[PDB]
Amino acid sequence: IQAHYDVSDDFFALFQDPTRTYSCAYFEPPELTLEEAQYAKVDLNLDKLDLKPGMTLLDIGCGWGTTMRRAVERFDVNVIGLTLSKNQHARCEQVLASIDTNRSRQVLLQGWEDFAEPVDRIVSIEAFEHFGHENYDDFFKRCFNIMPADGRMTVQSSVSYHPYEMAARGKKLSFETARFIKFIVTEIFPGGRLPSTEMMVEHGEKAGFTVPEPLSLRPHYIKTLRIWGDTLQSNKDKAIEVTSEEVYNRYMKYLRGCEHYFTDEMLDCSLVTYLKPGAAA
Numbered sequence: 001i002q003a004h005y006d007v008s009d010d011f012f013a014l015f016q017d018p019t020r021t022y023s024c025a026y027f028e029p030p031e032l033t034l035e036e037a038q039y040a041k042v043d044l045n046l047d048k049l050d051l052k053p054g055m056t057l058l059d060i061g062c063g064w065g066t067t068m069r070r071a072v073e074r075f076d077v078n079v080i081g082l083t084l085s086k087n088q089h090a091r092c093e094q095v096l097a098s099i100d101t102n103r104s105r106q107v108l109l110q111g112w113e114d115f116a117e118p119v120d121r122i123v124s125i126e127a128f129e130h131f132g133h134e135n136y137d138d139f140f141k142r143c144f145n146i147m148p149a150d151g152r153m154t155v156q157s158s159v160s161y162h163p164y165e166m167a168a169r170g171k172k173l174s175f176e177t178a179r180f181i182k183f184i185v186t187e188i189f190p191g192g193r194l195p196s197t198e199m200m201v202e203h204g205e206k207a208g209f210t211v212p213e214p215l216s217l218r219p220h221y222i223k224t225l226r227i228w229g230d231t232l233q234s235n236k237d238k239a240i241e242v243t244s245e246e247v248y249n250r251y252m253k254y255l256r257g258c259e260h261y262f263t264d265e266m267l268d269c270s271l272v273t274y275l276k277p278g279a280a281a
């Protein structure tokens, strides 16, 4: 049943950029291409982490390996990536092995749950939606515990608003948004759950982290989703051929719907920074 909403890598290749990044890009400056903006998003995350040569960076949910490789290349760090996909695992291995570096590089097919080795810094870009609210305490506790005194982590995640906050916008739109969120979390990220930004901040605080004001990426996700959607739609027949009209329609619903709900400010995307007590200034 969870395996039903699994789709082949070749479908995603029909809307994503060459880096295969499956998360909000960063159009700064606005004229960047999707691919460029995916790299700008990687940098935006990594630049907040106080990475020094010879550190070990952990990528939780490392996808196809772009973040890790960019970190090795820019920061001359060791890396370790965690992924739940065997295909991502095999590709990441290739991406990592081909880097001209003496730094250590490792990809593991496992969750953060089973990861407990010392790392200096943590990046997690839109894996958090999969974890479920019941695991937030354990996630933050693990991330706090594996890092040294000056550790830092970024988590980037799509977020929703509490039903109470949504109600301020009127019942109609509020119930309609909740249904669409339920759809995201059934058919796009099965077993998933969108946090609110408050939940992201507060669980981090409870674990002991200092949490500055989160960065909103809402207009960047709008641009991202627009390009993703326009691109899927243009590759429609190729999409249907490799999957079905069903699966095509599902992702168009997702992509258009999210853009719509982002434009309406009924969804957000937060880049939250977590600083251990001894983190540098």
Ligand SMILES: Nc1ncnc2c1ncn2[C@@H]1O[C@H](C[C@@H](N)CC[C@H](N)C(=O)O)[C@@H](O)[C@H]1O
Residues within 6 Å of the ligand: 020, 021, 022, 023, 060, 061, 062, 063, 064, 067, 082, 083, 084, 085, 088, 110, 111, 112, 113, 124, 125, 126, 127, 130, 131
């Ligand atoms: N418990 C977990 N531990 C580690 N990775 C996970 C977990 N749950 C989901 N993921 C991964 O999180 C990733 C989710 C993607 N949305 C983001 C991938 C990547 N960071 C990107 O920006 O492209 C996929 O690699 C999933 O396998």
